[PDB]
Symmetry: C5
Subunit: 103 residues, 5 copies
């Protein structure tokens, strides 16, 4: 198994590592029909999404998708600094695949 | 996908943005039969609900309605200030579709 | 839908509002068969329960009961003041139907 | 329904009330197969468990057990004082049936 | 049942105890297909994972795995000291079987 996020990220196509080194600036969450997602932004101006669960996801990614949204909400509320994000760049906003934080 | 709550809100009929910029003043939660809902208020007098899950909701919203109430409760308890609410105004009190927070 | 817990509570029979305006003095949780419940008490001597899920409850009340026990646990832990309780008074200890909290 | 942890504890066979009135010293959590359990210890010497789910539990006890582990984790992390524990003494280490915490 | 994590660890083959006595240095989480896992590292250089659920895991272990990720994120967030880790050493990074924390 991978041992860092850089590594996990280079196993997939259309992705990229973003070095954040910052807390989340805004948290957006929606429960509207077909728009059940989370958007975050940074002071740098970047915007990321956790995508609405869809046909592109495998079954084992569904619980992971709710956990990610859980993680982002709590990271926002505690002002925890995020280290890196591994994101899919064929979407807009770019879509979160993985996250890392370090103390 | 949408990049902000406002853009997401304007994909729906019967919605409107309230710019709150404030901590929730009060939190109500009910488990009584047919009234399984949350009600929040602001220092302004604005009252909002998370509707009781129903016929108007599609399957993918069911987890999202539950996430939304988890969000409103921890927001209330931490005194986190809400930025904007995207709400349906064909309900009374108005019904939340999406919420955003900024630090 | 109702806009306050008092209005909400008044839609049911065998219910009354308790105005607490105080933090929970003790929290009790049980996983014992047939007594899967939470009990809370106040410095006033008042005692209240979240009842065991039973044939009195309908379908949609199942997650709400779990949410209400989660809420009482975090309210206890953060020493958050409860404003009112809407309870069913045909049970002892009286049974929580709804909770509000003001900040 | 019972009104305190002691009345509730008296309804079962093989139980006993421990009045610890102290935080949890250590928290151990396992996901190893057939040992999916929580163990806690206190300064005064005792060691208690949350049993691995099994046929001795009825169906409404499955969610209760998960809740109980949730509670012991947060209680540990916050140093919340546990007042009493209703435990079954026909297991080793003794097994949690109920806990109480007080202000 | 085992009374400590070292007694529980030694019931399993291909396991060993890591005495960390330290707070988690980095927390990594991924929702990418087939890498639905969590990775933690320590100031000492040590690196550990929560494997992706698979056929080596029995159903009772599926909930325990979600529980273990939940525990690592909140442990990370609150800077809590991890006392010991019981890990499977036939995997890289080594895989968490059990965790323990004290004061
Ligand atoms: O490039 C991909 N996989 C390539 C193999 C990587 N590898 C898989 C086996 O174990 C080790 C890691 C790969 C790309 C994927 O990509 C797609 O779905 C994503 C959401 O997951 C995003 O929506 C992304 O925009 C989209 O293009 C999806 C999956 N998937 O959800 O199964 C795999
Ligand atoms: O305005 C709607 N359609 C607008 C399309 C926006 N959407 C973006 C993604 O691509 C699909 C279309 C729209 C209105 C809806 O409306 C209704 O349900 C809401 C709760 O869901 C509220 O209760 C609202 O008061 C009620 O009128 C419901 C849905 N729905 O639950 O599926 C869509
Ligand atoms: O909560 C109930 N919901 C079922 C229908 C609810 N309905 C829609 C919303 O506004 C008013 C009434 C409901 C609760 C009722 O109350 C009963 O169940 C409760 C738990 O739900 C309590 O245990 C209470 O002690 C018990 O007497 C009785 C009836 N009944 O006789 O129909 C309905
Ligand atoms: O928890 C039990 N609840 C089921 C019945 C509850 N009872 C119904 C009426 O209101 C008062 C309490 C119950 C527990 C019992 O105890 C058994 O299971 C427990 C876990 O739940 C512990 O593992 C304990 O060590 C074990 O002996 C034994 C019986 N029994 O031998 O019949 C019932
Ligand atoms: O080999 C295993 N069990 C077999 C023991 C059966 N038993 C042997 C002697 O006594 C009488 C009968 C066995 C191997 C295990 O290990 C396997 O799965 C683990 C996760 O569960 C890890 O992924 C690990 O790396 C992998 O080897 C784990 C378990 N487990 O978590 O239950 C059991």
């Amino acid at each position: 198994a991978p041992q860092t996020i850089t590594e996990l990220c280079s196993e997939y196509r259309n992705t990229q590592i973003y070095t954040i080194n910052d807390k989340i600036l805004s948290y957006t969450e929606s429960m509207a029909g077909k728009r059940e997602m989370v958007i975050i932004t940074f002071k740098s101006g970047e915007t990321f999404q956790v995508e609405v669960p869809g046909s592109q996801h495998i079954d084992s990614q569904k619980k992971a998708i709710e956990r990610m949204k859980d993680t982002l909400r709590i990271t926002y509320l505690t002002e925890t600094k995020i280290d890196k994000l591994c994101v899919w760049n064929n979407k807009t906003p770019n879509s979160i695949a993985a996250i890392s934080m370090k103390n």
